[PDB]
Amino acid sequence: SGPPGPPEKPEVSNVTKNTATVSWKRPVDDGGSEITGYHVERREKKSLRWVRAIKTPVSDLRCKVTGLQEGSTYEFRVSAENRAGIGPPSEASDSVLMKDAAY
Ligand SMILES: [Zn+2]
């Protein structure tokens, strides 16, 4: 009974100039104990390092990510944690370009 497995590929939606919604599913493998929260990370397209996209983990399976740079392209990934700790991350989401209202 250890940490969870990866969630499935997250989905990104409701993209504005500096916010987006990231949604995902509960990992198929919870490691044998209840999922207590999720880490969400982001990576600018063709940058190497993944960084925190939210200040602290969330419990719901979606969140509004803020503080994104207009004109930049980002991908997101999600890691689940249980009482035993953090599991490996999901595969990266599709990338999204941060652009303001197209109308
Ligand atoms: Zn954690």
Author numbering: 3 to 105
Task: Please give the exact wording used by the authors of the publication that reports this structure.
Titin is a protein expressed in the skeletal and cardiac, or striated, muscle of vertebrates that plays various roles in muscle structure and function. Encoded by the gene TTN, titin spans half a sarcomere (the basic contractile unit of muscle) and has various functions including preventing sarcomere over-extension (Gautel and Djinović-Carugo, 2016), acting as a molecular ruler for thick filament formation and as a hub for numerous signalling molecules (Kruger and Linke, 2011, Linke and Hamdani, 2014). Fn3 domains are only found in the A-band region of titin, where they are arranged with Ig domains in a pattern termed super-repeats, which themselves are repeated. Fn3 domains have a characteristic beta sandwich fold, with a core of hydrophobic residues as the “filling” between two beta sheets that pack against each other face-to-face.
Here we present the crystal structures of the titin domains Fn3-3, Fn3-11, Fn3-20, Fn3-49, Fn3-56, Fn3-85 and Fn3-90. Fn3-3 and Fn3-11 are found in the non-repetitive region of A-band titin near the tip of the thick filament, Fn3-20 is in the second D-zone super-repeat and Fn3-49, Fn3-56, Fn3-85 and Fn3-90 are located in the 1st, 2nd, 6th and 7th C-zone super-repeats, respectively. Fn3-20 is at position 6 of the D-zone super-repeat, and Fn3-49, Fn3-56, Fn3-85 and Fn3-90 are at the 11th, 10th, 6th and 2nd position of the C-zone super-repeat, respectively. All seven structures present a typical Fn3 fold of a beta sandwich composed of two beta sheets encompassing a hydrophobic core. The two variant domains, which each harbour a rare missense variant found in a cohort of HCM patients, closely align with their respective WT domains, with the mutated residue incorporated into the domain without affecting its conformation. Both the Arg15908His variant in Fn3-3, and Ser23226Gly variant in Fn3-56, however, result in the loss of polar contacts, and this is reflected in the loss of thermal stability of the domains. We see no evidence for dimerization in the crystal structures of the C-zone Fn3 domains determined here (Fn3-49, Fn3-56, Fn3-85 and Fn3-90), agreeing with these findings, and our crystal structures of Fn3 domains in the D-zone and at the end of the thick filament suggest the same organisation of titin Fn3 domains will also be found here.
